[PDB]
Write a protein that binds this DNA or RNA. Sequence first.
DNA 1: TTGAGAGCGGCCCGGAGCCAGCAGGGAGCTGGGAGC
DNA 2: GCTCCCAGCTCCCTGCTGGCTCCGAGTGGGTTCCGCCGCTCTCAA
Lengths: 116, 48, 326
Amino acid sequence: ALETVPKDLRHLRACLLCSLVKTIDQFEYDGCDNCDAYLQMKGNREMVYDCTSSSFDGIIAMMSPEDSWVSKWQRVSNFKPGVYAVSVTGRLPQGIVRELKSRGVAYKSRDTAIKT
Amino acid sequence: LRRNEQNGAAAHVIAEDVKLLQFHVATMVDNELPGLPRAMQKSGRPLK
Amino acid sequence: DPNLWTVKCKIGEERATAISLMRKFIAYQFTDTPLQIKSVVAPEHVKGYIYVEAYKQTHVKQAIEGVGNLRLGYWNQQMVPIKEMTDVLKVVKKSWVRLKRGIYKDDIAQVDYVEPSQNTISLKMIPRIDYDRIKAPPQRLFDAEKIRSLGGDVASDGDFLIFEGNRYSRKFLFKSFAMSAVITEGVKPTLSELEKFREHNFQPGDNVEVCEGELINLQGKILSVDGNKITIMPKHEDLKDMLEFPAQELRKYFKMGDHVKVIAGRFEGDTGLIVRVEENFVILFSDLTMHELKVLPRDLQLCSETASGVDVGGQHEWGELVQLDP
DNA sequence: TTGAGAGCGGCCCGGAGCCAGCAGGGAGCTGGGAGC
DNA sequence: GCTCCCAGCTCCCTGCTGGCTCCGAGTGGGTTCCGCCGCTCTCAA
């Protein structure tokens, strides 16, 4: 919805798990809107910097994951409507990855770009 | 075009600009061609 | 699946047009005239037009009948080839810098100090100024005395000086410039720039020897050339087979008594006959000028055209009458 | 500090071949049944 | 009842009509014309 819709083009940075592209303002006010329960994106900034990537190539204004071959490719047919990045450059800390694995959420890298 | 084929490899901009280059060389051959519009300079005189 | 249609947008404003059209879709999705298109693609390296994901050109027209950036493409639209969806979304990938804007565009600058704030960095430039003499510009050394004599906007602090809009110089303009206003990657200044502040070039027809490996002491003519690993097809003596060699394994070896050309350097553009080929030093007598020139094997090259005997500028040729003074 | 200017930087018929579309014999192909 | 002269078919091919390039007689002399727009910094108020 409009809450997930970014408001300005300043300080855009994409998440590492759902590749959610939103500004630091709404990351501070709400954090993530996809795996907030699994990540605790809200209430901090140091861990937000580690759990979000400032380098993303290409974005998609997907709204219908259930009937999108875009969503099929980028494995967000199960996530909500929103703005997602085709390529995300970064990786979670080993501690957070281990925590997610223990909770049962394997971390799949969103870096779909072809490195040479 | 050389740069685009070297790195971008768009294959759509590539084709479009290839067609434009063919048009430019055809213009160099003859400015007069029934099937396409004629070239011109900022002074408006059709090129020779 | 929906098909892609190419719609022309103003050059350099495709991102703005996409933002505006998605905003209008947000504003009019709940209205009686929602946008039936699915998405829009504006590739970073594609300027002039964008792609709209829709099933019908009618839907494309109804979507693009908004901002005037797409008026030119409003008249007609063009299908994107079926095989082209895969190509649509593909993305291909004390130092020295160069300024982007201002009169110092495309000029080498030496990074003197780097500010931790990541906002501006101190750079050493060669002033391209007329010293407030013509304006009411080739690179030249700063003249603090000259600018002081000319007066105007100038502040003297010994070797340090401020002039013409807070332009700072010391002994060489020393001014802070924005991080995004300069390029810190892919500058590679030349030796002249270093004084102010590898490479492989093989061509067909030249003879190169193998200086290492089991195929050492084999001289073959150059047939093909590549970037780094040539995998050359040498025409080795008493060997009809075409072997394979990289650029590093081969050396520009030339047989005694043959015409050679200087590819680059102080002796660039000269031709002559070698006198004695040492391990690295090749001494040759230039043909037009009976001058002894010592050059590296990499700096030599063979051609059938001799020296013209004219200056590079085409104003004076060798052995001519000039005016040393009136 | 801001506003504009100055200069750099980039963007009226002719004829005649000539093709392409269509139209009518025409022998191959295989049924058709006439004949043995 | 299967070849075979025949009939019908079926391609088959040579034989008729329409859009189209491209040219178009011999020297003075006069007037006009060769970007425009964007864009970023200097000096002035």
